[PDB]
Paper text:
Twenty-S rRNA accumulation 1 (Tsr1) is an essential 40S subunit biogenesis factor with homology to characterized GTPases. Tsr1 is a key nucleo-cytoplasmic pre-40S ribosome biogenesis factor that is essential for the final maturation of 20S rRNA to 18S rRNA91014. However, Tsr1 lacks all the conserved motifs required for guanine nucleotide binding and GTP hydrolysis, and is therefore a structural mimic of translational GTPases rather than a functional enzyme. Since Tsr1 is not catalytically active these data suggest that, rather than acting as a molecular switch, Tsr1 is a molecular gatekeeper that must be removed before key sites can be accessed to catalyse the final stages of pre-40S maturation.
Numbering used by the authors: 67 to 117, 120 to 312, 335 to 365, 369 to 380, 479 to 761, 763 to 787
The structure:
């Protein structure tokens, strides 16, 4: 009972700011018409919009509450998403004449829902164009209502802005009804800039002043800040405006370092240094998919040199594979990454620390001085036209680490997706061009997982890469920018930022194909596997298997052309002799994404 009074206060007084985003899901639907029909309900004529251009601050006197209306750039799909993630309420605009495009309008409903929506409302301003008779118009309104309920059953009736009865009910909801909270946005800080100015300090960099009201967890002078399509930046000063305090950047401020100082690799020896006449074999445990992992050796090149970093495994679930081991293939950044022991506990601690050590709480008007470089000012667009939102970053969020994303294919995405090709990933407001190693999610004791070359279509897979830490487990949207597509991007998949564990070891499989030709009572001769007698001698330790379900071992080399004799438990001139080998796959560093 007490909690309801405290939660209302920030928005139910002369110092409130309610973010409302107008999202018309149809090509031939104007957002200004949707706004005019919504602002018509209030008796104050001086509220009405003509020629602020897209982002307006309107004070509705009928419900004694300030409203902040945002109109996105419909040419850019990502801008529509950007305006909605900052919104407290989203006004979806449906058309009576034109149907919602599956490739664009429908995809907006899909993408906004997957990145996180605070509150939604169905609205029709195009009902007049259908018919003159109310019997024909209501049949169209009911048809749109069934479509809107299919995406989310939270809304039962799609309000029509034509009738003053339904339009007054919408404004009453946008002004009085408390909006829902978005986990990642509200646990961070978020300020929608009303006015942006710049102060020169040096001929290279200065201070970018942002005036706005704090929403979410709040802001701290030491904590880093993030401007979308610009990057992460450090703060210098923050001024609090109160109706009848200044917080400065300390010695304990966060650094803009992506990786640890060059030399950190020399201060820790968690390395399994390994030194042989026979190839490596790990037998610690108890004993479509084959085709993509199959490999074929070249006759000129030796298999010892090619498959040097490969290990034979009796069982991948029980093998003693180790993290941080000595390997030349491993990235240089590996030791310079953020190593989090227990993500679950570090995530809760930083969140609790941020809320408790917050300087400018939600509802406070602030003047944010951001240490900004002068060269980036040419890309800054008017805050009244294009949404200028500043999202606060938690402790060590800038720092890169071995991050794990859960990812499921976007509905009706039959196209394949390989596990090394660059894909843009939007986790929260941040977006980076990620090269993700896919692996099927499993509860293995050794945390060793088989590296899948392509995204599995039946279930949800796990993408592993090197990217900065997200301490809010923000939902992730995976896309590839397409120029041929209506919306400048081609949405690949959706998911969530799982954790930041390096303990997840990924192993690439290599299956050697071999064909038997000669058959003695016990001695079976295979030929298409190796092409050197030395190569046969080296891989002798790794047991052989057959696609028919037989098991065996290499006896010795026959000729100088890699022919070999082998003994099996059960095969003919039609069976395929095979050998499975495994190598460690290291995560790949990712670059940021703007525009």
């Amino acid at each position: 009972l007490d909690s309801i009074e405290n939660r209302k206060l920030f928005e139910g007084k002369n110092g409130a700011a309610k973010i409302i985003t107008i999202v018309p899901l149809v090509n031939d639907l104007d957002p200004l018409d949707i706004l005019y029909k919504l602002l018509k309900c209030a008796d104050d004529e001086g509220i009405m919009v003509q020629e602020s251009k897209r982002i307006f601050n309107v004070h509705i006197k009928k419900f004694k509450s300030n409203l902040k209306i945002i109109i996105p750039d419909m040419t850019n799909f990502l801008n529509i998403l950007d305006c909605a993630k900052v919104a407290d309420f989203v006004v979806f605009g449906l058309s009576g004449v034109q149907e919602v495009d599956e490739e664009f309008g429908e995809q907006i409903i899909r993408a906004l829902e997957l990145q996180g929506i605070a509150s939604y409302i169905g609205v029709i301003s195009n009902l007049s164009a259908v018919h003159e008779k109310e019997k024909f118009q209501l049949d169209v309104k009911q048809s749109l209502e069934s479509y809107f309920k299919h995406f989310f059953p939270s809304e039962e009736r799609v309000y029509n802005l034509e009738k003053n009865s339904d339009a007054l009910n919408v404004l009453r909801t946008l002004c009085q009804r408390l909006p829902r909270s978005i986990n990642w946005r509200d646990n961070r800080g978020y300020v929608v800039a009303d006015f942006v100015d710049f102060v020169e300090t040096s001929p290279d960099s200065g201070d970018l002043v942002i005036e706005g009201t704090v929403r979410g967890i709040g802001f701290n002078a030491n904590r880093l800040v993030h401007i979308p399509d610009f990057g992460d930046f450090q703060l210098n000063k923050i001024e609090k405006i109160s109706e009848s305090t200044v917080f400065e950047s300390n010695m304990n401020r966060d650094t803009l370092d992506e990786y640890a100082p060059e030399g950190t690799e020399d201060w820790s020896d968690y390395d399994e240094d390994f030194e042989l006449t026979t190839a490596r074999y790990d037998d610690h445990g108890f004993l479509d998919r084959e085709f993509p992992d199959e490999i074929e050796l070249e006759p000129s090149e030796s298999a010892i040199e090619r498959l040097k970093r490969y290990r034979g495994l009796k069982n991948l679930y029980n093998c003693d594979w180790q993290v941080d081991e000595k390997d030349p293939s491993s990235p240089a950044e590996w030791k310079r990454l953020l190593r989090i022991g227990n993500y679950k506990n570090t995530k809760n601690r930083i969140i609790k620390e941020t809320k408790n050590e917050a300087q400018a709480i939600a509802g406070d008007r602030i003047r944010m001085f951001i240490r900004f470089p002068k060269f980036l000012l040419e890309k800054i667009q008017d805050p009244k036209q294009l949404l200028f939102a500043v999202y606060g970053l938690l402790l060590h969020e800038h720092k890169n680490a071995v991050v794990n994303f859960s990812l499921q294919r976007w509905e009706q995405y039959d196209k394949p997706v390989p596990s090394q090709e660059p894909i843009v990933v939007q986790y929260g407001v941040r977006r980076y061009t990620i090269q993700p190693l896919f692996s099927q999610g499993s509860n293995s004791p050794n945390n060793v997982h088989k590296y899948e070359r392509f995204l599995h279509p039946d279930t949800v897979s796990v993408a592993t890469c090197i990217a900065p830490v997200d301490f809010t487990q923000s939902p992730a949207i995976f896309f590839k920018p397409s120029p041929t597509d209506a919306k400048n991007i081609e949405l690949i998949g959706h998911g969530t930022f799982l954790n930041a564990d390096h303990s997840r070891i990924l192993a690439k499989r290599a299956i050697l194909t071999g064909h038997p030709f000669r058959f003695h009572k016990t001695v079976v001769t295979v030929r298409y596997m190796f092409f050197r007698p030395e190569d046969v001698e080296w891989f002798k330790s790794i047991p052989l298997f057959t696609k028919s379900g037989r098991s065996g071992f290499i006896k010795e080399s026959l000729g100088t052309h890699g022919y070999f004799k082998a003994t099996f438990d059960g095969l003919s001139a039609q069976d395929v002799v095979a050998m499975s080998l495994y190598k460690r796959m290291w995560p790949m560093p990712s670059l940021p994404w703007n525009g």
